[PDB]
Amino acid sequence: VVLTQTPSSVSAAVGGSVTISCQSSQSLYNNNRLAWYQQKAGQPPKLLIYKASTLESGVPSRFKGSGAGTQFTLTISDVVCDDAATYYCAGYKSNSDDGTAFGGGTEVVVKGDPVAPTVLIFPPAADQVATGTVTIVCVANKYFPDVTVTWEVDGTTQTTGIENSKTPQNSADCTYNLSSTLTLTSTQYNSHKEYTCKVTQGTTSVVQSFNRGDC
C-alpha cells in the first residue's frame, strides 16, 4: 500500500485551521485503519488519531479525524504554537508485504506574531587558530519570519565555508533561532581583520562585527 499525503507543507495563523489529506492506493482494512501522528525534533511520533477518527487519550478535541476507505483527512482547529510540527498518516491493508505504510509527511508552520532578531557574533576561542582551521559563530535569536545570512571579511562578501542551522518553532511563541558558522584556514584568518555577520529579515537587517585581536 502507498499513502499519498498532501500538502507536503502548509502555513497557518494562530487560531486558524489546517487541513491534511491522505489518499491510499488501495482500500484499507475495514475501510478505517488510518492513524495520524505528530512529530517534533529529537522525539518519536505521538499518536493523535486512530481507526480514522478515534482520539488517543490526552489529545484535545481540536484534532479531528475523518474519512473512509481510500480518502482520509486530519483537520486541526484553533491552531496553537505547540501544533507546529511534522504530521504523518499511517495505513494498513493486511499482514503481508507492504501491508503497512507511512505517508510522506506534512510540515505545519504556525504564523506567530512577527519579531525581529537580536544578533550575537562569537569570535574564535584562542584554541582554534592553533588547530589550523578556525570557525566563527553567529547566532540570531527569537525571530519570525525566516532570515538569510551574509558573511563579509574586510567588506568583501563570502561564498564558501558557511553552514547554517535553525531551531524548530518555539511551542510558546512560534519563533525560530538560527546559528550560522564561517570556516577559514588560519592563514586566511590571520590575514584579514574586519569580520562581519549580516542577518536580514526582508526590510530589516542586523549587522554584527568584530576586529581580529581586539583582545
Binding site: 484499507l28 482494512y29 485503519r33 488510518l34 492513524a35 501522528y37 512529530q39 525534533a41 518519536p44 511520533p45 499518536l47 486512530y50 481507526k51 478515534t54 488517543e56 504523518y88 499511517a90 495505513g91 494498513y92 499482514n95 503481508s96 508485504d97 507492504d98 501491508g99 503497512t100 505504510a101 507511512f102 505517508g103 510522506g104 509527511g105 550575537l120 557574533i121 562569537f122 569570535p123 574564535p124 576561542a125 584554541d127 582554534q128 588547530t131 570557525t135 559563530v137 547566532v139 535569536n141 553552514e163 547554517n164 542551522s165 535553525k166 531551531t167 533561532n177 538560527l178 546559528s179 558558522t181 568584530f210 581586539d214 583582545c215
Partner: protein, 222 residues
C-alpha cells in the same frame, strides 16, 4: 512501559548489524511489534512486524524482505538482523507496538501508540572522531551587560549523535541547542547557547558522545 532499542556503532558499507528492543512492564509475543526508521531530515519508513504467539505472523516491506530479518529472541526482546548495509540505511531505527483496544477486543493496523527513543545506525567508510569543543563568548572589548549569552561550539565529530546539557541538566531555562550540520568532509558540527544573569556563577556545558565514549565538560566565562 518502555521500549529501549540498542545496537549499531558506525559500520562500513557491506557489513551486517543486529538491533535489539527490550521491553519494560509489557510482554511482546501477544502484540504486533514493528521496526520503523527515519533517515536524517527525511520521513518515516515502515520495515516489518511480528507477533510471536499463537500462529506466528511476520510481514515485511518490499525493500526489506531478503535483506533484513525480524525475529523474537525472548518474551521481552525483538531483533532486526540487517545485512549488506549501504549508506542509505543510515537512520534512526525505532521499535513500536501496533495495537489499539476497543472494549473487550484487541485490534491492530498502523496504530503505533508505544515507541522507543531510537538507536542511530550509521553506515559510512569514515573513521569515528570525538568532537573538538570550544567556548563561545562575546568579544572582550564589549562592555559587560546585565545578562549575557554564552555557548559551546561542538566541532567536527562522527558519527551522530552528540548530547549537550548545561550544569548536569540543572540549568534548563534559556538553553538553545541547534541541530547538527554535516560538512563537505563528512564531520558534524553543532552549537549550544544559554542566557544567564552575569552575577550567577559559571556555566558549564557537558558534551557527551557515546559513539567514542567521550564526555567533555567546558566551563565558560565572559
Amino acid at each position: 512501559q518502555s521500549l529501549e532499542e540498542s545496537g549499531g556503532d558506525l559500520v562500513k558499507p557491506g557489513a551486517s548489524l543486529t538491533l535489539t528492543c527490550k521491553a519494560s512492564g509489557l510482554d511482546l509475543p501477544s502484540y504486533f511489534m514493528c521496526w520503523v526508521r527515519q533517515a536524517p531530515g527525511k520521513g518515516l519508513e515502515w520495515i516489518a512486524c511480528i507477533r510471536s504467539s499463537s500462529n506466528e505472523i511476520l510481514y515485511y516491506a518490499s525493500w526489506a524482505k531478503g535483506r533484513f530479518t525480524i525475529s523474537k529472541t525472548s518474551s521481552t526482546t525483538v531483533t532486526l538482523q540487517m545485512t549488506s548495509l549501504t549508506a542509505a540505511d543510515t537512520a534512526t531505527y525505532f521499535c513500536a507496538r501496533d495495537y489499539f483496544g476497543e472494549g473487550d477486543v484487541f485490534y491492530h493496523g498502523g496504530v503505533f501508540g508505544l515507541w522507543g527513543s531510537g538507536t542511530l545506525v550509521t553506515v559510512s567508510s569514515g573513521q569515528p572522531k570525538a568532537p573538538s569543543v570550544f567556548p563561545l563568548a562575546p568579544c572582550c572589548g564589549d562592555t559587560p551587560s546585565s545578562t549575557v549569552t554564552l555557548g559551546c561550539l561542538v566541532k567536527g565529530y562522527l558519527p551522530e549523535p552528540v548530547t549537550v546539557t548545561w550544569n548536569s541538566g540543572t540549568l534548563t531555562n534559556g538553553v538553545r541547542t541547534f541541530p547538527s550540520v554535516r560538512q563537505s568532509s563528512g564531520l558534524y558540527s553543532l552549537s549550544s547557547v544559554v542566557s544567564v544573569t552575569s552575577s550567577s556563577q559559571p556555566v558549564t556545558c557537558n558534551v557527551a558522545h557515546p559513539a567514542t565514549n567521550t564526555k567533555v565538560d567546558k566551563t565558560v566565562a565572559p
